[PDB]
């Protein structure tokens with residue numbers, strides 16, 4: 118997909134459904150990117166808080182992880198305050214007059230939490246084991262986690278054969294995964310960083326694809342219920 122938003126109204130309406138929803142905002146600068154949240158939004162500014170530092174005087178790049186899809190834009194630092202014995206800096210930016218929304222997924226990706234000890238586990242070709250945490254999951258694949266991948270066997274379109282989804286109370290399914298990307302991700306003592314592996318399912322049998330559909334359905338049901 119592809120769509121551009123200009124309306125001053127849509128923009129702040131969007132910056133508030135995402136403040137309220139406490140959704141992740143990723144900021145680009147130096148060389149890496151930092152993930153965090155909005156803390157304030159008004160008629161001209163939005164605020165975030167990080168203990169890092171950012172190139173004043175320059176339109177830096179932002180990106181919102183929204184349920185509506187990827188929302189990209191560029192804004193310029195306007196203010197910055199310094200406080201606390203534990204240094205947490207307060208940056209105030211300007212509202213972009215231009216956004217961009219991209220949503221190319223024909224399947225909603227369910228996000229895993231504390232009550233979900235989901236793992237993916239296997240053995241590479243060299244005979245070494247891996248064990249990834251599952252971060253999210255859909256009918257067509259999953260986004261994995263690890264601090265110590267073997268970057269070698271995780272080449273674009275490389276495939277983890279005879280992997281085994283360990284889905285806890287749902288049991289274990291044996292699948293093939295196709296690696297679509299490998300990325301490093303950073304959150305913020307606790308300044309974090311792990312590798313996200315983007316995976317596409319390659320089903321061994323067909324019941325496999327159905328059993329996952331039913332499972333993911335049961336996760337979405339406990340999602341709306343429970344809380």
Ligand SMILES: Nc1nc2c(ncn2[C@@H]2O[C@@H]3COP(=O)(O)O[C@H]4[C@@H](O)[C@H](n5cnc6c(=O)[nH]c(N)nc65)O[C@@H]4COP(=O)(O)O[C@H]3[C@H]2O)c(=O)[nH]1
Pocket residue numbers: 180181182183184185186187188219220221222260297298300313315
């Ligand atoms: N080739 C490929 N890579 C995947 C796929 N899913 C996840 N990735 C990778 O995993 C990174 C993080 O994905 P995310 O946490 O969902 O965080 C994403 C997501 O929140 C949002 N986004 C991007 N595209 C979409 C989309 O099509 N639909 C939705 N709902 N959000 C999107 O923007 C965030 C950053 O996007 P990226 O910079 O590209 O960084 C992406 C991207 O490199 C996939 O299906 N195919």
Ligand SMILES: Nc1nc2c(ncn2[C@@H]2O[C@@H]3COP(=O)(O)O[C@H]4[C@@H](O)[C@H](n5cnc6c(=O)[nH]c(N)nc65)O[C@@H]4COP(=O)(O)O[C@H]3[C@H]2O)c(=O)[nH]1
Pocket residue numbers: 221222223224226253254255256257258259260261297314315316317318
């Ligand atoms: N739960 C989960 N599923 C994954 C992941 N990576 C791939 N998949 C699955 O693999 C399919 C194909 O991914 P793609 O070839 O990169 O083909 C994708 C990709 O080109 C692009 N795309 C989607 N999300 C992202 C993203 O976050 N970042 C970037 N750069 N591209 C994305 O849109 C194409 C269609 O996206 P989908 O319909 O969602 O179809 C996706 C999706 O069903 C993952 O990390 N987690």
